[PDB]
Amino acid sequence: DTSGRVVRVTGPVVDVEFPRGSIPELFNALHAEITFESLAKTLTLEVAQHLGDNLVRTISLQPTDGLVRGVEVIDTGRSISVPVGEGVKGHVFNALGDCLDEPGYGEKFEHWSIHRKPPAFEELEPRTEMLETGLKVVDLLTPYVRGGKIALFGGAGVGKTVLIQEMINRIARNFGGTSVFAGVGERTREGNDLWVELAEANVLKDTALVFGQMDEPPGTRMRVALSALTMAEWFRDEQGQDVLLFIDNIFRFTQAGSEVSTLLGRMPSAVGYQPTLADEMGELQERITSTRGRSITSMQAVYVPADDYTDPAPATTFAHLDATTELSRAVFSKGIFPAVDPLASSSTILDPSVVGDEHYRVAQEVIRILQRYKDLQDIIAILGIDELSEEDKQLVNRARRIERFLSQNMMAAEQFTGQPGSTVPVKETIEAFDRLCKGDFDHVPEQAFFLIGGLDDLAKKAESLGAKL
Amino acid sequence: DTSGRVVRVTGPVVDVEFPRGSIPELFNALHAEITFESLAKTLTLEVAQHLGDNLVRTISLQPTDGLVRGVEVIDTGRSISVPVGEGVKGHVFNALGDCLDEPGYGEKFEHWSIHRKPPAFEELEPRTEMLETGLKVVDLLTPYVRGGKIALFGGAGVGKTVLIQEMINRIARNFGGTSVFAGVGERTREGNDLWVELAEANVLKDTALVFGQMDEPPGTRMRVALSALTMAEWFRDEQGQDVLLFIDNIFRFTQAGSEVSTLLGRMPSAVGYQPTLADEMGELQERITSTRGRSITSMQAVYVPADDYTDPAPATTFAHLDATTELSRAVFSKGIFPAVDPLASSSTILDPSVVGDEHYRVAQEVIRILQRYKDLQDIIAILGIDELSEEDKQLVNRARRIERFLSQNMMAAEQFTGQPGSTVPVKETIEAFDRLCKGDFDHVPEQAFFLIGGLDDLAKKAESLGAKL
Amino acid sequence: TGIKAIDAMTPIGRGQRQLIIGDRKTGKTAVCVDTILNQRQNWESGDPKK
Numbered sequence A, B: 001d002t003s004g005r006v007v008r009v010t011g012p013v014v015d016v017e018f019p020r021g022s023i024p025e026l027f028n029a030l031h032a033e034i035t036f037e038s039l040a041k042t043l044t045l046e047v048a049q050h051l052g053d054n055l056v057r058t059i060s061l062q063p064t065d066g067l068v069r070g071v072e073v074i075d076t077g078r079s080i081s082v083p084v085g086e087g088v089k090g091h092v093f094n095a096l097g098d099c100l101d102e103p104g105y106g107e108k109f110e111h112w113s114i115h116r117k118p119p120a121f122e123e124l125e126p127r128t129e130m131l132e133t134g135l136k137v138v139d140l141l142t143p144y145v146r147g148g149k150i151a152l153f154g155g156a157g158v159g160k161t162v163l164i165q166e167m168i169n170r171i172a173r174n175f176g177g178t179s180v181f182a183g184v185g186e187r188t189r190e191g192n193d194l195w196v197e198l199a200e201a202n203v204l205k206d207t208a209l210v211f212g213q214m215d216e217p218p219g220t221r222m223r224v225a226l227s228a229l230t231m232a233e234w235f236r237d238e239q240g241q242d243v244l245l246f247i248d249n250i251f252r253f254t255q256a257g258s259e260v261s262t263l264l265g266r267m268p269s270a271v272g273y274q275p276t277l278a279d280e281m282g283e284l285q286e287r288i289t290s291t292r293g294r295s296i297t298s299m300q301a302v303y304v305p306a307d308d309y310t311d312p313a314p315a316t317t318f319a320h321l322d323a324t325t326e327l328s329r330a331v332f333s334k335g336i337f338p339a340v341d342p343l344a345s346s347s348t349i350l351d352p353s354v355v356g357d358e359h360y361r362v363a364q365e366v367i368r369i370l371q372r373y374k375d376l377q378d379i380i381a382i383l384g385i386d387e388l389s390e391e392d393k394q395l396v397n398r399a400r401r402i403e404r405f406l407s408q409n410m411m412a413a414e415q416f417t418g419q420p421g422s423t424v425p426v427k428e429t430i431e432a433f434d435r436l437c438k439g440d441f442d443h444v445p446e447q448a449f450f451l452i453g454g455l456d457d458l459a460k461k462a463e464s465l466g467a468k469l
Numbered sequence C: 001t002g003i004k005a006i007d008a009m010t011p012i013g014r015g016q017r018q019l020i021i022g023d024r025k026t027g028k029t030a031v032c033v034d035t036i037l038n039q040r041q042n043w044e045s046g047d048p049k050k
């Protein structure tokens, strides 16, 4: 007839031969069967390449352990589809679209293909509206954008997930729209933790969760982000109501693409990443966008391999963002939380014509003081502060106090330390940092600027440390 | 008949098939046709390898866009030949031997193959005669050899082209022989600049220019140096009178050989260079020489990739030269011009038996002072100059004045500083640097040494700043 | 280009190829867009030589 036949099985990549004239199109979904009674399942393969001689190379979305050569492969005729609609709010889903908490749910919904095209160029408009969070460093030096793309870069264990949870607490709770959370190649324990904490915070009824985690074959970790993005695209286009999209470790999407590319027999590029790194990253990231009149505020955590910010994956991700919060291990080791590197982080709306003159001036002054401190850091490391000029000593004192005052006790840090969170309005932040960079607090010790909120918290901690403002 | 047939076209490398017995020898010139009316031309192909089974792998000298598989390839039976004789002087030529400003000129001249063997060893003779240029640093620390091999090393955009223009101004303007200039894979703006500036100085009537620039395929950049070298070899062997051979960024020969080494089927060497790097560089560089009684004063510019003097191309070029003027970006960043590194540059006629006892003593003292200064620079940067001795502070003042007095306002840099150029005889240079090292000008500020000529210019600029000497 | 630093220290002429090289978020696109915007008076002049 017209059904295929497995020929080669190289890991989670499967080559399938089809009768001529019946070759499945790229991205089509095929179904194979594993009959080994403990691993019995139905594999969903995705056509990746046409090899010739009626061969087709596909990426399996489930582990191929137990697959035999010559078994029948059924071409479904369409690409992988996921449920879309209001019904997906409040449930946990797979990369294939299967509900996890309530199996069989959503099989009667409208189903959308996970491979869409990005919006046309004539539909795009730049977003320059500030999103106020309540964090001092984020609101001052890297203000977030309403309907823009945000990322949190960082090495291993510097606070990317804790900052994702902080932004879920701050932005997604007081929200009026709908939220989607994709967990790409991350911990399953964290997925369960988020599921439970969104159930108890009464936020789950507005959030749709899609999880493809660390214990999945690279195809699942490559396509789960597309599934969640498809649900978000439905919420943006068909319903048009202020979507939020959190993606946990888009870098795991990149890494699964790397592994799949190695298995497909492609030539390795620099470092070892796939040759189609930027192309896949662009095909994904260009659908995470707000069109004219319809919003998607996006926030992604990006892992930085071996703390190497010049790695091809984060270096390619950088070009797709409106605000990049970069977490450093140097800042993380000093106990400053969030461990935001203030000199590397950036935002496209830190512009006098967007945030105002005083905001921008105070931010530039803070950055100048911190850059001078970083310039002196070498001499300070060998000879200490005692050898600098008097101007430089004053500036280093101001810079230590500033780099400590950018720290803050976050709402999500109450689980680690027991101290509740703090919200600081942006005007109070600007005023406080203006007073710092002007020298109005050079007498308060270096501590008492550590993990507090606004100026009242500073006054309380200084008066508990025997100082005044 | 006995013609060829194009079988494969992968970029600049073309495979051709010939009947048995009609296989062209290595380095022959074949002619193919491109008939597309917007790109119609006659491809010249240089036989590079015999692939077996009557196949032949050739490198194209023109872009292969528009070349069809199976077209006729005519074997000329000889290698690429260029016009030679006293009639090539005053004209701009091609890598193929075609006149650019007056096409058709030279088709009735004697034509010499561009492939030669280097002179026999029994004809080689060491050259130990100083070529007085007029630059303080060159005349002092890197005395050029008359009839010898000179090079200018340096990264991207330090001083090489300006220094070669300066040396064309100094050595070639009042020369009693012939000059040949090979522009090997350089800019075309600079080629037109040189053409116009040689027509202005009435030097063009004695100079033969051969240009294959950066926009040309790697075959032209690989063979233009050989064409110009064949013209110079004719002027040396047949006419026999005092050739000058300038070559801009000869490295481009190595780089063009490296661009096609993988397409020719060779495994790459250490830093991505061809395995035959040193062998080809030796085959080329050994023809650029003065035999006994026949002189060729050669002067090449050598690009150092990424300022790394350990790169295999400059590291292999270093062995073919009698004098090397090595330019640094650290000296370029300080405003000192020419940006010669006095501690890295060298010459073989820097010998008490060649340049005299006082020249050599002054040069060695300058080098010692500058080395001690380079050793103290880090201490001075971290701990401050007041931490040194009094001997060391004296030496540091002297070394700063000396490193500023090695700079000079060159004739070819009037376009960059608006200031006319200077010329300093070698005896004035020797005595001036003797007085500097002895300490006769330790009361003149650090300026008034910067971009000047001899001691009279030093007095003028010192009095312009309120000082004497 | 309308920029003092570029027009004074690294001047650009018509026919030249000047490279704007740097890290990310240093002002490369800013420099190029300002160079484009500075030609408004040249365009409003009217003669094809300006």
Ligand SMILES: Nc1ncnc2c1ncn2[C@@H]1O[C@H](COP(=O)(O)OP(=O)(O)OP(=O)(O)O)[C@@H](O)[C@H]1O
Pocket (backbone or CB within 6 Å): A347, A348, A349, A350, A351, C023, C024, C025, C026, C027, C028, C029, C030, C031
């Ligand atoms: N001359 C300037 N003065 C003040 N601010 C500037 C200047 N040039 C650029 N900026 C600011 O720098 C920010 C980013 O600069 P820009 O986008 O031009 O850099 P870029 O080289 O394009 O980096 P990327 O391509 O990675 O975005 C802009 O928000 C702009 O406000």
Ligand SMILES: Nc1ncnc2c1ncn2[C@@H]1O[C@H](COP(=O)(O)OP(=O)(O)O)[C@@H](O)[C@H]1O
Pocket (backbone or CB within 6 Å): A154, A155, A156, A157, A158, A159, A160, A161, A162, A163, A337, A338, A410, A412, A413, A416, A417
């Ligand atoms: N704001 C904070 N306050 C206190 N502790 C923190 C804070 N952020 C992170 N930490 C600690 O550092 C660790 C960071 O983990 P996390 O950032 O979730 O890892 P990753 O960045 O790999 O996702 C947490 O286990 C937590 O104990």
Ligand SMILES: Nc1ncnc2c1ncn2[C@@H]1O[C@H](COP(=O)(O)OP(=O)(O)O)[C@@H](O)[C@H]1O
Pocket (backbone or CB within 6 Å): B154, B155, B156, B157, B158, B159, B160, B161, B162, B163, B337, B338, B410, B413, B416, B417
């Ligand atoms: N003697 C000099 N005086 C002033 N500027 C110089 C001098 N030599 C080089 N430069 C500067 O260096 C730039 C490029 O130098 P060049 O020698 O052309 O680079 P390369 O060595 O890569 O060919 C010039 O535009 C010029 O501004």
Ligand SMILES: [Mg+2]
Pocket (backbone or CB within 6 Å): A160, A161, A186
């Ligand atoms: Mg994490």
Ligand SMILES: [Mg+2]
Pocket (backbone or CB within 6 Å): B160, B161, B162, B249
């Ligand atoms: Mg040059």
Ligand SMILES: [Mg+2]
Pocket (backbone or CB within 6 Å): C028, C029, C030
């Ligand atoms: Mg830009």
